[PDB]
Structure 1
Amino acid sequence: TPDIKLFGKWSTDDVQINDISLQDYIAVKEKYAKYLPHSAGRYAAKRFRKAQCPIVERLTNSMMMHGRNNGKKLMTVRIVKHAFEIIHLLTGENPLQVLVNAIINSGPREDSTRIRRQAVDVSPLRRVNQAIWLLCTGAREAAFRNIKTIAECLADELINAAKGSSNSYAIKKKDELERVAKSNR
């Protein structure tokens, strides 16, 4: 059937990926459109099959961290649902488009490594992975020991990062990573 739309409400179509470096490492489009961010797996068998995972599933997997909630997918699936509900009603557009823009603006574009350190550029896949990882860990440390719940801490983290506010945790880490690599150049 056509118009496969996430949670039965969010249409995956009309989501544009402006950056061409991350065309084929982001899975949101018609072939990769599903109803839920839950799926069987087999996505870790080969090396580059990791990039064929729908990115909402990738975000969902990365929220199951810090011990207490390993192997709790349904709780995180619920978390993303409510996060997408209030990204829509707070900004007024498709939550999927906000998430895609958050990934692009968050992933670092050059990192430092030991070859005293040497500055190297990052591959598109690791650019996506650090984008997802930074967004989740920013929400996790914001919601800890605080009255505000996890679902909106993730939501406002995405909204801040989608605009490149430099107030979000993810953008602050991105600027710190590249500026150090700038010095090590």
Structure 2
Amino acid sequence: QVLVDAVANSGPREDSCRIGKGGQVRRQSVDVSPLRRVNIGIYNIATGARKAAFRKVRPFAECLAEEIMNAAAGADKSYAISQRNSVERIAVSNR
């Protein structure tokens, strides 16, 4: 249950892409399909755990669990939530 809750709360709901041309970024805000959302949530979980356990004494598994719990709690201490928020803001800025 915790894992599904995390994969839900992690995953963007909006993103920016280049379509407006005009010789510049001209990025346009768009929406995001569910499959991409789950894929990105998983990727972010794994990546955040990986970055912590490197050259640190603690093991990979504890980092994994911590990331999962924090993301499921909706807390922004985690890496996943932070990336989600980042993307959402750079998007809404471009909407």
| TM-score, reference length from structure 2 | 0.92
Q: Deviations over 1:111-143 (max 9, x none)?
A: 111012111110000011000011000000011
Ranges in structure 2 where 5+ consecutive residues have no aligned partner: 20-24
Classify the secondary structure of the residue corresponding to 2:6. Answer: helix
Classify the secondary structure of the residue corresponding to 1:166. Answer: coil
Superposition map of 1:16-165 within 5 A: 97-115=1-19, 116=25, 117-165=27-75
Measure the CA separation in 1 of the matches of 2:72 and 2:39. Answer: 16
Please say which structure displays the higher CA radius of gyration: 1
Aligned residues: 89
- Which protein, 1 or 2, shows the higher relative CO under an 8 Å CA cutoff with sep ≥ 6? 2
TM-superposed CA distance for 1:164, in Å, is: 1.1
* Aligned counterpart, 1:173: 83
Q: Runs ≥4 in structure 1, deviation > 2 angstroms?
A: none
TM-superposed CA distance for 1:110, in Å, is: 0.6
RMSD of equivalent CA atoms:
0.5
Q: Deviations over 1:56-94 (max 9, x none)?
A: xxxxxxxxxxxxxxxxxxxxxxxxxxxxxxxxxxxxxxx
How many percent of aligned residue pairs carry the same amino acid? 63
Which letter maps to 1:154?
A: L
